[PDB]
Amino acid sequence: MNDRDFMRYSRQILLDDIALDGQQKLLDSQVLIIGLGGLGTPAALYLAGAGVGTLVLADDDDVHLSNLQRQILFTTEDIDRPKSQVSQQRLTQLNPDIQLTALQQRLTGEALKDAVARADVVLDCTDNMATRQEINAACVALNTPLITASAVGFGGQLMVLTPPWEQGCYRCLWPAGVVGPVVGVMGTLQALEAIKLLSGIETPAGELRLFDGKSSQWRSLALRRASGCPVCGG
Amino acid sequence: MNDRDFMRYSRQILLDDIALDGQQKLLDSQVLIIGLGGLGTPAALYLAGAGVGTLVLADDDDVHLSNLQRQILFTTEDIDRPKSQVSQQRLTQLNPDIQLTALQQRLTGEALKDAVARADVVLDCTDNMATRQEINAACVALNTPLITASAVGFGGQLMVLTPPWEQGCYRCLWPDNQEPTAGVVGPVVGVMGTLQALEAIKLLSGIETPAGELRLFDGKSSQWRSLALRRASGCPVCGG
Amino acid sequence: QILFNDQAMQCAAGQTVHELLEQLDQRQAGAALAINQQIVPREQWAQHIVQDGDQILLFQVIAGG
Amino acid sequence: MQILFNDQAMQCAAGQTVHELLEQLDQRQAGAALAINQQIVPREQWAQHIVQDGDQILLFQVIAGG
Ligand SMILES: [Ca+2]
Ligand SMILES: [Ca+2]
Ligand code: NA
Ligand code: NA
Ligand SMILES: [Zn+2]
Ligand SMILES: [Zn+2]
């Protein structure tokens, strides 16, 4: 890689688990982030800083004042502008050397499938079950790993789902406000899982991690595939 | 608070644990963030978004290109500029309605004591033992809660230390004044700083939560463990 | 004798997960359950027999983001 | 008798202090903290704290970066 990338990514290149080959792998990768809200904005910021070669940012909402309490990539001057465009602009300022693609729309059907197809990993940062079920269906069908997280109030949940779906999928598991740093910790952890998966770092997958930000405790549960699953059961 | 504040903090206000009363207490509080690096930049972003009324941002560095991999508040356009100034400017863009104070300095001695005294809670987001011991000594002497965290490689450490210091202080755990600058994964140091913001919001809004617990994170195995802290009888800081 | 949501309580041997949830009057919609830190798929609740010493968790899905 | 040391099973003599055990394992004390059964044991107590059969011990180093 060129001198500018070496200096820019030097603090993670110093890590023997990533180093020059691991960074090159991130630079050759493509990540699809669906939803640019509480979860997606910190995730996109960390992934752009880490040097993921191409980030595809999908969202069809505009920035609203009430968003700023937790969507840290935005500012008051972005209010009423399309989130994917503002994200693309701000992330470019952070790292102008990677490819940032903005999709201003509700990714669904054929369009969702082409984007999941091109991605090496998909981050589900949406806010409703119908959409999460549709993204999960596309990832399994296209055999693409999915990193999904959620948060509400003081609680968070996260799971890394990867081919051959030995611990099942989102559908096997699932057939008020929110505190900013709780959704933020979940989105940041999604970024951490993507970096590890793209750089080839051995780590667990197939576990549901639950966070209670009020008792400040975490618990890990082993996911299990459901024999009757219409998505990954065969 | 006014109508603009009501809308801005609405998703936090909907939580019965915070509500209108808790938001007002955040708005009336003061937080000192020492260190505007991997830990400090996300903590400041979230605390600003949360409506902490006054944030004091202290750091003695200028932005460098290699910072961007983990210090998410900065951009390529800020390279070579003072960190506390850039942070104050970027954060007012996020939230122009709170008080943002920039201290471009390595807080020590009298200046440190005065900033600690004025803050309701201090976030230690620095990067060396000596400074961390100095901050801890000031917080205990001035009876000010201290939320401290660190990260290196794939690991992180976090503790919330509050008066009357029932579980001791930073010096009860670490008697060392020096270790016995390495790599780090962006989101690992980021999660520790974001967790520091979370602890601050709970402390300032009055949410019952544990303190005096050392929380350790291994980002590679994806596991957390919580250890009960214990005061040291001969601690020269909180030993009394 | 089992742990339900980290709290001890007494049950009744040979009972299914479904039987147990029914007696406790718990909503099973939007709910998932684990036994000894492993998820038990919902489709298996009718047949899965709760054993003595089982550590059970019943929680709700969070979809927000 | 038998203990867990950093999540791994290990055998060691009965009647040993934390200091003697760390000495046996050739572990450096500077920059380290120790927990037994999930509670920190302040370093100032290691020379007298007796390790007991079935103890779960963690020995880790301070991280100061940020
Ligand atoms: Ca299958
Ligand atoms: Ca409410
Ligand atoms: Na793909
Ligand atoms: Na104070
Ligand atoms: Zn499935
Ligand atoms: Zn002390």
Curated annotation (Swiss-Prot), chain A:
Task: Identify the enzyme class.
Answer: transferase
Coiled-coil annotation: which residues? none
One of this protein's GO BP terms? thiazole biosynthetic process
Is Zinc found in the keyword set? yes
Q: Which cofactor does it need?
A: Zn(2+)
User: Hey, which pathway is this one from?
Assistant: Cofactor biosynthesis; thiamine diphosphate biosynthesis
Entries under Pfam families matching the protein: ThiF
* Keyword Cytoplasm part of the UniProt annotation: no
Sites where the protein binds Zn(2+): 169, 172, 229, 232
Record text on cofactor binding: Binds 1 zinc ion per subunit.
Q: Quote the catalytic activity from the record.
A: [ThiS sulfur-carrier protein]-C-terminal Gly-Gly + ATP + H(+) = [ThiS sulfur-carrier protein]-C-terminal Gly-Gly-AMP + diphosphate
**Alphabetic keyword roster:** ATP-binding, Metal-binding, Nucleotide-binding, Nucleotidyltransferase, Thiamine biosynthesis, Thioester bond, Transferase, Zinc
**Could you name the domain of life of the organism this protein comes from?**
Bacteria
GO terms for molecular function, please?
AMPylase activity; ATP binding; nucleotidyltransferase activity; protein homodimerization activity; sulfotransferase activity; thiosulfate-cyanide sulfurtransferase activity; ubiquitin-like modifier activating enzyme activity; zinc ion binding
What NCBIfam families would the database entry show? adenyl_thiF (TIGR02356), PRK05690.1 (NF004281)
Which family, according to UniProt? Belongs to the HesA/MoeB/ThiF family.
Listed under subunit, the entry gives: Homodimer.
Q: What is this protein called?
A: Sulfur carrier protein ThiS adenylyltransferase
Swiss-Prot record, chain B:
Q: Is Hydrolase included in the keywords of this UniProt record?
A: no
Fetch the Pfam families from UniProt: ThiF (PF00899)
Write out the GO cellular component annotations. adenylyltransferase complex; cytoplasm; cytosol; sulfurtransferase complex
Q: Where is the signal peptide?
A: none
The first-level EC class reads: transferase
Keyword Transferase tagged: yes
Give the protein's cofactors: Zn(2+)
Copy out the cofactor comment: Binds 1 zinc ion per subunit.
Task: Cite the binding residues for ATP.
Answer: 11, 38, 59, 70, 83, 107, 127-131
Q: Keyword set for this entry?
A: ATP-binding, Metal-binding, Nucleotide-binding, Nucleotidyltransferase, Thiamine biosynthesis, Thioester bond, Transferase, Zinc
Q: Name one GO molecular function term.
A: zinc ion binding
Query: Quick one: which residues bind Zn(2+)?
Result: 169, 172, 235, 238
Q: Per the record, what is the consequence of mutating residue 174 to A?
A: No adenylation of ThiS
Positions the record marks as coiled coil are: none
Which reaction is catalysed here? [ThiS sulfur-carrier protein]-C-terminal Gly-Gly + ATP + H(+) = [ThiS sulfur-carrier protein]-C-terminal Gly-Gly-AMP + diphosphate
Q: What are the recorded Gene Ontology BP terms?
A: thiamine biosynthetic process; thiamine diphosphate biosynthetic process; thiazole biosynthetic process
Pathway-wise, it operates in: Cofactor biosynthesis; thiamine diphosphate biosynthesis
Q: What is its EC number?
A: 2.7.7.73
Tell me the protein family, please: Belongs to the HesA/MoeB/ThiF family.
Q: Write down the NCBIfam families for this protein, in alphabetical order.
A: adenyl_thiF, PRK05690.1
Described by its record, this protein's role is as follows: Catalyzes the adenylation by ATP of the carboxyl group of the C-terminal glycine of sulfur carrier protein ThiS.
Could you give the subunit structure recorded for this chain? Homodimer.
Protein name (Swiss-Prot/TrEMBL): Sulfur carrier protein ThiS adenylyltransferase
Can you name the source organism? Escherichia coli (strain K12)
- Taxonomic lineage of the native organism: Bacteria, Pseudomonadati, Pseudomonadota, Gammaproteobacteria, Enterobacterales
Curated annotation (Swiss-Prot), chain D:
Sorted alphabetically, the Gene Ontology BP terms of this entry are:
thiamine biosynthetic process; thiamine diphosphate biosynthetic process; thiazole biosynthetic process
Record's GO cellular component terms:
adenylyltransferase complex; sulfurtransferase complex
Pfam family membership, one: ThiS
Keywords in alphabetical order: Nucleotide-binding, Phosphoprotein, Thiamine biosynthesis, Thioester bond
**Post-translational modification, as annotated:** C-terminal thiocarboxylation occurs in 2 steps, it is first acyl-adenylated (-COAMP) by ThiF, then thiocarboxylated (-COSH) by ThiI.
Q: In which pathway does it act?
A: Cofactor biosynthesis; thiamine diphosphate biosynthesis
Q: Name one GO molecular function term.
A: nucleotide binding
Q: Which residues carry this modification: 1-thioglycine?
A: 66
Matching entries from InterPro entries are given as: Beta-grasp_dom_sf (IPR012675), Mopterin_synth/thiamin_S_b (IPR016155), Thi_S (IPR010035), ThiS/MoaD-like (IPR003749)
Q: Where is this cross-link: Glycyl cysteine dithioester (Gly-Cys) (interchain with C-184 in ThiF)?
A: 66
| Glycyl adenylate, modified sites | 66
Q: Which SUPFAM superfamilies match?
A: MoaD/ThiS (SSF54285)
Q: According to its UniProt entry, what is the function of this protein?
A: Is the sulfur donor in the synthesis of the thiazole phosphate moiety of thiamine phosphate.
Q: Which family does it belong to?
A: Belongs to the sulfur carrier protein ThiS family.
- What is the name of the protein in this document? Sulfur carrier protein ThiS
Supply the gene name.
Answer: thiS
